[PDB]
Symmetry: C4
Amino acid sequence: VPATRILLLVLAVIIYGTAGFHFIEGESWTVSLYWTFVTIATVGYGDYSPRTPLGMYFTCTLIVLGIGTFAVAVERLLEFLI
Amino acid sequence: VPATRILLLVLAVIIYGTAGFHFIEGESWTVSLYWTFVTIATVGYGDYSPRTPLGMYFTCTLIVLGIGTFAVAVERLLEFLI
Amino acid sequence: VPATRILLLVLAVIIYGTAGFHFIEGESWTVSLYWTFVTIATVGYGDYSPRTPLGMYFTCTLIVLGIGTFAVAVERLLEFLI
Amino acid sequence: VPATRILLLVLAVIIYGTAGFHFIEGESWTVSLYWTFVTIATVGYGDYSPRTPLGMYFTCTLIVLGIGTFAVAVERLLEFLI
Ligand SMILES: [K+]
Ligand SMILES: [K+]
Ligand SMILES: [K+]
Ligand SMILES: [K+]
Ligand SMILES: [K+]
């Protein structure tokens, strides 16, 4: 699968996660972007996390849609850097 | 291994984790489902975590049974979405 | 690599992590075992974490020695269960 | 890719993450090294995490540059130990 397509897919995940956290959980755009990376990378510091049932359901969807996409993106980036 | 079988396996893990956390640690069904996804995806925010020895042992079993199952499920989903 | 050998390797990691956390950080044997699984699986709730410089260095060694070993163990277990 | 080259790459990531956290977030060199391992391994305890917008952006860059590099390093180490 072309590297650039994987890039677009991970960008779409990032937009989805950031806007979702911002609107559902009410955190700033910057915090929401940071939380999205931390979540889809599976780092999960827990400095930010959803507090609402909708936010919890949303987070599960982001986990399912985002962790695999991010994993493929990082491995494709590895190839270009290495 | 057929994608639908992997789906059933991950659903079984989700049921096991959710019911276990709910009954052992006493959190709501929704929180317990959320905690199960967060745990088997290895995100591990730590907003919820077991506080009892039984809950700790149970969590180790969920980790062993669930992380691999979830990993295979997400990669199979990737194929269908990509 | 034989599945049983991978089993022994992950058990050795578990012993190393549990005894190390118990003696360096002073937590109970049960908490230390739980923390070891949570760490080598990369779940990392953060309900327990090292507070001392020695504990921090030790945790880095466990991360390096344990995450790969655990990953191989879970995938080998997948095969037997599936 | 030669194992020793992967070693140098992961060391470079470790230096980048440690110095960055130390200077941006103001934590000690030891805490910063520990946080770097915890982050690139995706353990993410959350005992330490960035509190500033710059630190958040920096952490996202470390996540992208470091998680894949660390993953390849651990698997290469597995081979030598096994
Ligand atoms: K984690
Ligand atoms: K955490
Ligand atoms: K993998
Ligand atoms: K993780
Ligand atoms: K975590």
